[PDB]
Design a protein around this ligand. Structure first.
Ligand SMILES: Nc1ncnc2c1ncn2[C@@H]1O[C@H](COP(=O)(O)OP(=O)(O)O)[C@@H](O)[C@H]1O
Ligand SMILES: Nc1ncnc2c1ncn2[C@@H]1O[C@H](COP(=O)(O)OP(=O)(O)O)[C@@H](O)[C@H]1O
Lengths: 395, 392, 83
């Protein structure tokens, strides 16, 4: 493994908003809402790295729409870009407001990696995104997403975040555990990974070329299920601990129709062009893999740069419930990606809303800005481990 | 059949929310609604397992929609996740407000099958769903519904209710009585049953042979109709009556009993997406000719969107069960009635029997994976597997 | 559709749920305030208000009596070509 190294050293910064200015801002919000038609009793504040969490206890006899209508009008009065209104807090009576704070940090990727939590994720394929509004690290497991949809209107970062998750895959893995396959619509950035010993094929450019890789993934999932049902065990992890306990002291088993089958990751940069060139074959193959991929260990990470309903359909929302949406410029698109609304009121530069598997409670996650420098440093530090071994039956 | 005691006995626990605490909640509800633009009077409190129903005589002059547009505001003034507001209760002049409790207790499944309304119940396909809000058990006959649709938001307890339905079959079944086919496009959780005598095929994963099984269902439906029409009985039940009573004389009636075949389909969203509208017409014709055939259907969807739960699916099937769905567009979609936004999750069934009725709110019983494994082991010890070769 | 409703003027609505369905069949908001058990609205041939007329409950037993009384004094009469 590459050690905790080649990262940017998290520089010394100390601008943590001492409660003099915070109390001043709280009384300022109380006045600037009292100017409008609401009465507000501010209760407690959670200051953070990017925004500042507030807790309004509103007075007797006032709704929440009398806050949520005037998000724009309050936003032109607090010297911010756009404030965000949280309409339900877990377990308290308050009504949340997240003010943009006009001196932010870039969330260092090392600060995400140096958590105790990242050293304690047991799974081989984690997803290190960043900190939340409290500044606590938010790391998710890709084996229980089971898939992922990425938004963003060339806004905060849509390339970054994909690069971030991929480099976070690379820092806790081996090529005998997790090998990826990318499909590149615009051969711009992720034609940089060529040369690593976990990359099953070179870069894919054409959508008509990419359909061969998708059908390769479908065929690999099918023989994966044939191999699993020939071994009785349900999913992949139980099968790999079975092959551990089988060939531990030496008890051979090859050709059941042999090592751990790797957790294959398929990633897509620009899904919009993939539908726009090939309209029908791709979307049905994506829903096919989204149906039967979770048990097989094959996974899919999608990413659209347009949040239209032409791209995101019910067929893509068939089996990928976990959503990551960055800043988008449309409340209609805010309810396109998320089943909730409000994802237009974000700030940019690595800001995402994380929507977890299943339950409707949108986590706000500040993604870690990782440079191209660390990308093609970790690529070079990783090319020691071998050669880009290929299975050319993918095409 | 196995004894009921193989699974978990009753939760020996009740947190008696005091008349002091209920009176405090009543006055708190009164004052919080008095702060908004309504005037209110609590009269009677009826607590329960998950929620606590407050009947209300409202003040003179106030409407009801002015209450029902205060769900979010009353929620944040009472610190819950949602306040479902029943707009009508017959026999009284009351506006029902339902408020979740502090300690949401869990519904034990033996407590569900402890009921005399399960015990003396003798239809071959009961689906014990669980408790009503007053702790009352609710078991509905699948032979009377005779189809049901299930929906939710992914992981709200769809498949938990399916496991509850399957164990509710298995604890009152012999393979002569009941019979199973389990189409599942994901192989995730319903595959545990694979090996029981009550099946006809293995747990069908791939969907094209599932379409073969559905065409076999339509063919068995037609063959069974010709069999009853040659024997001259309307439905399946009176036919089994005639067959077994002629058997008691000593003559099995020759062929020119029958099992109550239940064909469940967890997650027919991928069924209608992978294979096209012909599967939808198979669902249509099955749910057309079923209630005399004894061929019932159990469905499920993680997406209750209009292009999946299309009017042909909604054509026959009267009975619907909704878990916590995302918004009132989807509640108006499936239940043809608003309301299903405001449940809590973890097995909240807005049950909907056939007929122009207000929907019944009941809770599922959380059956584990482990009890399912216990029942699978108990039957694979007790009964031997049985299949059909050329079913597909 | 607008191809079956416009051809057939006289229609009877039982209790339906939505007022939208009341405007669908009756083209007038009445069919949502009924009681079940055969509570009709009789939209008459021609135009007017819907005339609320109750149904007449009849069991299957009297239907069996009618079936047997027409089996006694009756004989079948079929056509091959219609099937
Ligand atoms: N936390 C951050 N701070 C500053 N800049 C950032 C941050 N996160 C991302 N960015 C920059 O914003 C840019 C957004 O690019 P992006 O919208 O992803 O382009 P594309 O849509 O073509 O992929 C990125 O190239 C990245 O350099
Ligand atoms: N009665 C219950 N008590 C506690 N948790 C429940 C109950 N019913 C359902 N759940 C929760 O529902 C989830 C299962 O959802 P599931 O039926 O698998 O839906 P899906 O198949 O869409 O994932 C589990 O996380 C479980 O905790």
């Amino acid at each position: 493994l590459p050690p905790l190294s080649l990262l940017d050293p998290a520089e010394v910064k100390q601008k943590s908003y001492s409660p003099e200015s915070l109390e001043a801002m709280s009384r300022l919000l109380e006045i600037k809402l009292k100017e409008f038609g609401v009465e507000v009793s501010v209760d407690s504040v959670h200051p953070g790295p990017v925004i500042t969490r507030f807790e309004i206890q509103p007075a007797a006899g006032v709704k929440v729409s009398r806050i949520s209508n005037l998000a724009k009008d309050l936003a032109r009065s607090l010297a911010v870009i756009s404030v965000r209104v949280v309409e339900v807090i877990p377990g308290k009576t308050t009504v949340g407001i997240e003010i943009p704070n006009e001196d932010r940090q870039m969330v260092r990727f090392s600060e995400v990696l140096s958590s105790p939590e990242y050293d304690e994720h047991k799974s081989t394929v984690p997803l290190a995104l960043g900190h939340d509004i409290g500044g606590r690290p938010i790391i998710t497991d890709l084996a229980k997403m089971p898939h992922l949809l990425v938004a963003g209107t060339t806004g905060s970062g849509k390339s970054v975040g994909v690069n971030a998750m991929l480099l976070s895959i690379l820092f806790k893995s081996t090529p005998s555990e997790a090998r990826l396959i990318m499909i590149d619509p615009k051969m711009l950035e992720l034609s940089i990974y060529e040369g690593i010993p976990h990359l099953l094929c070179p870069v894919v450019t054409d959508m008509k070329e990419a359909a061969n890789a998708l059908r390769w993934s479908v065929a690999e999932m099918e023989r994966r299920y044939r191999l699993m049902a020939a071994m009785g065990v349900r999913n992949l992890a139980g099968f790999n601990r079975k092959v551990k306990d089988a060939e531990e002291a030496g008890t051979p088993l090859t050709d059941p129709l042999l090592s751990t089958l790797p957790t294959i990751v398929v990633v897509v940069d620009e899904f919009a062009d993939m539908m726009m060139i090939v309209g029908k074959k791709v979307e049905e193959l994506i829903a096919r893999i989204a149906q039967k991929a979770r048990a097989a260990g094959i996974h899919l990470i999608l990413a659209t740069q347009r949040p239209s309903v032409d791209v995101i359909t019910g067929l893509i929302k068939a089996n990928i419930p976990t959503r990551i949406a960055f800043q988008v410029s449309s409340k209609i698109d805010s309810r396109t990606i998320l089943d909730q609304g409000g994802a237009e009121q974000l700030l940019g530069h690595g800001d995402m809303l994380y929507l977890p598997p299943g339950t409707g409670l949108p986590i706000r996650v500040h993604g870690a800005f990782v440079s191209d420098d660390e990308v093609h440093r970790v690529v070079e530090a990783w090319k020691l481990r071998g050669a880009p071994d290929y299975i050319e039956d993918i095409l």
